[PDB]
Curated annotation (Swiss-Prot):
Localization: Nucleus
Gene disruption: observed consequences: Mice are viable but fail to produce mature B or T-lymphocytes. Very immature lymphoid cells are present in primary lymphoid organs. These cells do not rearrange their immunoglobulin or T-cell receptor loci. Double knockout with TREX1 does not show a visible phenotype.
Effect on the protein upon substituting residue 274 to Q: Does not affect the endonuclease activity of the RAG complex
Transmembrane intervals: none
Native source organism of the sequence: Mus musculus (Mouse)
Effect on the protein upon substituting residue 196 to N: Does not affect the endonuclease activity of the RAG complex
Subunit structure, interactors included: Component of the RAG complex composed of core components RAG1 and RAG2, and associated component HMGB1 or HMGB2.
Protein name: V(D)J recombination-activating protein 2
Primary role: Core component of the RAG complex, a multiprotein complex that mediates the DNA cleavage phase during V(D)J recombination. V(D)J recombination assembles a diverse repertoire of immunoglobulin and T-cell receptor genes in developing B and T-lymphocytes through rearrangement of different V (variable), in some cases D (diversity), and J (joining) gene segments.
GO MF, any single term: phosphatidylinositol-4,5-bisphosphate binding
Whole sequence portion shown: 1 to 350 of 527
Reported impact of residue 193 to Q: Does not affect the endonuclease activity of the RAG complex
GO cellular component: nucleoplasm; nucleus
Domain comment in the entry: The atypical PHD-type zinc finger recognizes and binds histone H3 trimethylated on 'Lys-4' (H3K4me3).
DNA sequence: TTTTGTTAAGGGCTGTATCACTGTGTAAGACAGGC
């Protein structure tokens, strides 16, 4: 794992905590810019290309049949296999939470210049309340595909919300949501094993299962060291969901996850306590019914990283993470690194 | 029969309206990078 500093072009201000990166056919893209999109890039979607440790953000265009989704911070994202990206929830530049779900796909790649399709999917049934900091992944069971959504935070319900605490947030009830994108429907499942709310956790999806790692629970103000396996079977039109607690769970919120090889993932970064950062790294190796979490060699962090109180980042896709920390003195607002695996 | 106003010309304290003067905030422009 080699750490490398990155320089940024004129529009560095766009990058903020809560941003996301999506990878299409090796090409990386950036979404969730700070502020509302400007004339320079009306979509809020950017080619995110790092050449010789220099990062350029170049505006990307939408197809004629696209939505223009608002920039979203801490939305739930996953990748769907004809490869597309699912974005659900998040905070908008006006601090509202969206209940909408957007789908990003490549509409046209002409002479290495990508046009995107952003389509909004209506959701009916048990729609999950607007959220941020929650997970969504795709499971495959019995030749059928289903979305699994869990966790996050939201504002108080319209009945109890008051202007003195107008921005107060609470964890959502820990109901797993099965989401059929084909029909646009959502079903909620209460499980006894998920008693507490959880947000900013990590989710790993393999076949018919999603594992839930770390995260932070507001009510207890704990980052629990639990690992949850959630299995989904889809026999015809009657889905079934079952959860199992598995000991050996890491305790981490806001960690970043990257795939280094099939059935092996690396977990880097995050927070172990409010004032402490998780400097260690984990390797997760997947079996068809087993999951293994092993400590790995901690990278050669610089002193700036070691002493930073906050860091934020995203997975670039090619086993490489894009990281960031703030700096004061004279000078830059943010300093960015790329950690390879 | 007892209190006040009043005239005119004119003489000091007092109150406020400027002086001159510059730093400084805001904004009207100019300008140059998007390797």
């Amino acid at each position: 794992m080699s750490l490398q500093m990155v320089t940024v072009g004129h529009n560095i201000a766009l990058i903020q905590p809560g941003f996301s990166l999506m990878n299409f056919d090796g090409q990386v893209f950036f979404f969730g810019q700070k502020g509302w999109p400007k004339r320079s890039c009306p979509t809020g979607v950017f080619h995110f290309d790092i050449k010789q440790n220099h990062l350029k953000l170049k505006p990307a265009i939408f197809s004629k049949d696209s939505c223009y989704l608002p920039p979203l911070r801490y939305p739930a994202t996953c990748s769907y296999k004809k490869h597309q990206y699912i974005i659900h929830g998040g905070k908008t530049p006006n601090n509202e939470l969206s209940d909408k779900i957007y789908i990003m796909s490549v509409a046209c790649k002409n002479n290495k210049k990508v046009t995107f399709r952003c389509t909004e999917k209506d959701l009916v049934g048990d729609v999950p309340e607007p959220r941020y900091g929650h997970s969504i992944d795709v499971v495959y069971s019995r030749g059928k595909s289903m979305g699994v959504l869990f966790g996050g935070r939201s504002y108080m319900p319209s009945t109890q919300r008051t202007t003195e605490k107008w921005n107060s947030v609470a964890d959502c009830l820990p109901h797993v949501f099965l989401i059929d994108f084909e029909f646009g429907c959502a079903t909620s499942y209460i499980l006894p094993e998920l008693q507490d709310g959880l947000s900013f956790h990590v989710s790993i999806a393999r076949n018919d299962t999603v594992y839930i790692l770390g995260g932070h629970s507001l009510a207890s103000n704990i980052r629990p060291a639990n690992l949850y396996r959630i299995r989904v079977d889809l026999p015809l039109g009657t889905p079934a969901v079952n959860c199992t607690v598995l000991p050996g769970g890491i305790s981490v919120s806001s960690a970043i996850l990257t795939q280094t090889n099939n059935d092996e993932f690396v977990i880097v970064g995050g927070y172990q306590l409010e004032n402490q950062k998780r400097m260690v790294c984990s390797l997760v190796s997947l079996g068809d019914n087993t999951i293994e979490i092993s400590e790995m060699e901690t990278p050669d962090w610089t002193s700036d990283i070691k002493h930073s109180k906050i860091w934020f980042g995203s997975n670039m896709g090619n086993g490489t993470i894009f990281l960031g920390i703030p700096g004061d003195n004279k000078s830059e607002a943010f300093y960015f690194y790329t950690l390879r695996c």
